[PDB]
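In response to a reviewer's request, we include the raw inputs and outputs for one of the modeled complexes. The three entities were modeled together in a single run.
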Amino acid sequence: LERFELDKRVAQRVKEQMDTNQREYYLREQMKAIQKELGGEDGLSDLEA
Amino acid sequence: LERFELDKRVAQRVKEQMDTNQREYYLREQMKAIQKELGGEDGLSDLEALRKKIEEVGMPEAVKTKALKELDRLERMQQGSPEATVARTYLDWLTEVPW
Amino acid sequence: RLELPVIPLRNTVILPHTTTPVDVGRAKSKRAVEEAMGADRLIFLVAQRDPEVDDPAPDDLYTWGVQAVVKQAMRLPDGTLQVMVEARARAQVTDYIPGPYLRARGEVFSEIFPIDEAVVRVLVEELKEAFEKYVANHKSLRLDRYQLEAVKGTSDPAMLADTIAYHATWTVAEKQEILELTDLEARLKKVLGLLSRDLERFELDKRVAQRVKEQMDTNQREYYLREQMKAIQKELGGEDGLSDLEA
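The model returned the following structure tokens for the whole complex.
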């Protein structure tokens, strides 16, 4: 009973892992996306300036 | 009539100017919004406090702009690099001196 | 110029011809609502300060308010008294009564008349165009024309300017300022400009959505590229096993 209970525990856990990984991955993706169109994208340039 | 049409066109031009300027800060808002939902919270609003404290104190506008450039230079490595460390120090210096 | 008790709000500036269920959560402000029902069903909603006031104060109310009317006087004794109001039209405010509950000796309906109908109807049509594409483009709101097309007898363009501005979700401080505006089309230009700014945000969303889609397509394509390499390299894997076997 308890072994299958922790099987379900790690089942919800592993689904949360995929949910978390998808969300993390996606979040860093659109911050890359916003970084593509910024004045601060060019503001990082020092010797280029 | 020509003067009034010129005035409305100039007002519209300044309107798109300020709207796109706000669009840049909305992009900044969304980027900091990304930083909070990801873990770390930007060191619990580390640069967020810095940027606001700089630009809650009255600056010349050139100072605000070059401060934003030096701010966005913090996309770099910061482990002894004199390109984020000196940037951190310079940012804090602009943050702390009275105006 | 008459006493109507002012119902405090948190920050919501009630605009004319905008049906609003006002959730009066303060027990110090519920008495204003009860006096508004007991005051010939004549509400004088004057908006508080743009920041949500910790204590509704007479000086926290602006010099302009709206003379609303009780629409649905059902009872909710839950502490957060929900009153469904609709502002008849805006009016200016002269002097106040100390509270809470807040009251003020407000004034008569101070409106701006529909003047120069040609340009005004033209800008209202442009505003309704911007608002209709706002409704049909901004999925973040999806608010129908059931509070704008629902009002037709009072076709005052200030009423529509305050209704369309209400239908969108920019800052309500600008709604307070446009309620204090005396120019009919500067109200219309202000709503149209804020709608254009919102549509600029929306097209920015489309632009960044295109950037993220191309970026994920790029990552996917590189992933397929590497696994080909792995499907092009694994070609001789079996031979390696054979040489690693009897050979």
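As requested, we also summarize the result in words. The longest helix of chain B spans residues 2-37. Residues 39 and 56 of chain B are 27 Å apart (CA to CA).
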